Amino acid sequence: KFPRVKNWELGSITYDTLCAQSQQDGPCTPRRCLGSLVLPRPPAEQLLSQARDFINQYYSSIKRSGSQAHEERLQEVEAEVASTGTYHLRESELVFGAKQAWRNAPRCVGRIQWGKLQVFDARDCSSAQEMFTYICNHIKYATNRGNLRSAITVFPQRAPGRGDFRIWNSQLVRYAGYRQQDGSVRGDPANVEITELCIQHGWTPGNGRFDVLPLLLQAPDEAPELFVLPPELVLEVPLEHPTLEWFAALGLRWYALPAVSNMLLEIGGLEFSAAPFSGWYMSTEIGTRNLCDPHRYNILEDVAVCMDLDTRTTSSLWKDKAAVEINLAVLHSFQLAKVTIVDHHAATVSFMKHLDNEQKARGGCPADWAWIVPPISGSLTPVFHQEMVNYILSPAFRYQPDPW
Template sequence: MTAVDNEPITFDLDAAEGFLRMFHVAHPEAGPVGPRLSRVRDEVAGTGTYRHTPEELSYGARIALRDSGWCTSGVPWRRLKVRDLRGFRNAAAVAGGCVEHLRLAGNGGEIRPLITVFAPDGPTAPGPCIWNEQLIRYAGYPDGPDRRLGDRRYAAFTDTVRGMGWQPPEARGRFDVLPLVVETAHEGARLFTVPPDVVHEVRLEHPELPWFGRLGLRWHAVPVIANMRLSIGGVHYPAAPFNSWFVGSEIGARSLADEHAHGAAREVAEAMGLDTSTERSLWRDRAVVELNRAVLHSFDLAQVTITDHHAESLHRLSWLRSRQRPAGNRPAFRLDPGAARRARAGGPARFSPHPVETTRPQYPGRLAELLRRRAGT
């Protein structure tokens, strides 16, 4: 067996059978489940795992996203596009697939929900993993004259990738895009620059405050969650990035306003002339409201898909009333403790005891171009 995060990979045949029965109930055109179960049992007996058909993979990924709660309102989960890249195990290929995911999902502002599935864990060859929490995240700089520069949530991650060879821009900014970190068992952790042409950002302005645009705030358009493990019928896909679209308050309240992230609430409040000497003035609340208004206004102005937190609250209540209860054989997205630590601290590496490879960022644009030509897009 291969150790991953210091835990052996084991196979759950009951989960496979439960999922396949579920799939065949939903897809009667696939025929009776018995012959498929027999083939899977033989495959597991011979290899220690089995391979999903493209139809099974698509169904499992869609159900996992639907049931996870990450599917924002308005997303037609039955029509989510599933990109089957299970043959991609090398870091450069995975990075190129992620770049193409961003390109396709951006879709000129009309965000297209996608899931890209890379190679699974297996008894002899564990799948790759992506360290980043999202494919696009901004650096945080805890050192230097301005300790408030950038996104403080990723200050430790920024330090780690700098130690691995990433060079931030000579003039550091508040919105410097971090490199992708892709780790494989045979290559270690490698860095890849995210090409600027797939980083679609929206510059923020306010519908009523003309000075707001001069603050220089902006945010990326596509939230691609990258570090969750997709589990389908006993098979685990550690790299399966997926996206829907942003809820405005995720950007305005959580990422921009929060003192532990970009900390822009005070800056906005001071520009509004509010009393920031005491919390009882509720300056922070007023600033957050205006940040959220600016986000929704700017995304709408740029014709980039976004939803607001009121619509999302209604959607979430409906989801809670109708969702399936967790079961071992249902497809799911899961965040492993090690993956959560890597996303914020930049370690520890998934494949212990292999050392993290020190390398300069690589530009995957050429690979993405080849993939795009092959797909005929």
């Protein structure tokens, strides 16, 4: 029942016992494994049970399980759900749950920081305009002049028979994707749909490759509202290469703050449909995926032709050589600009530590191998040689339907 988890670079071995705590099901069955798939294909009792577990998790955290404070807080929850069908979290319990959801994110390689998370309580939000203020503050705090600080702002929980508070953008800061005449796309191809919704909603579009998009914020059962972000609020890094003087002339650049905003935060059965978070970028996200995915800026061939590689045959490894300089350009530029960034070697080594801290702490750590291993130089990182067990622990961050 309990999985033997071996590391093939050091021969070490551990046994994940934490997985027993998983209450929800994944996509795999003995018949077949769907671990590489990206996406997955309330009764007072159901909710009440999730709540109980959460509160028990909280009091155990403050090392006061079974105490008076515990017993009474459990009754409050019972009382509220029994009469209203739902309940609410106390700011401290929320702070704990947020850190925990991050702690349980199988796809996050930066979890060595899970304990250092600034939680903003925005549950007293009744309008989109109010959401925008909270967001504008999350950004100022989070960015901190280039010295990034992990943070999350939490908006009103979902409610039976009432629309969701949502941030239509998958990230607080993103570059527009402008479909053009010849099926072409100027900018970030992954953001075409949202850039179009922004237009149909009255935004006056630009024509740059890196035009920061406006936010479509939506308060319950109301049409989304467009809000433009103060340019000086959006810290960005121009990319230049340490030795290739011609790199800078490509005009490439990327924003400093990675703030996911399309995910749902679930804590004790309660669902928070709008709870943007942000820590800091790992260089490959920008250097490998964002700039080199064939369905993103797809700049691989350009940079290679620049370097003067033989982009005529796969055997010259021009793709591999270009990819590395671009990642080097990112790491160099963020350091030059004094903005928090972490390379993939540094990051994965730290994640290796996290795995160890968690083994002693909880008896395991849920991890999605395909996501933890970097998009380049996989086996050159420790995590590649590390076996992992993936499963669902709550508090958790889940994906949710786009509100349109």
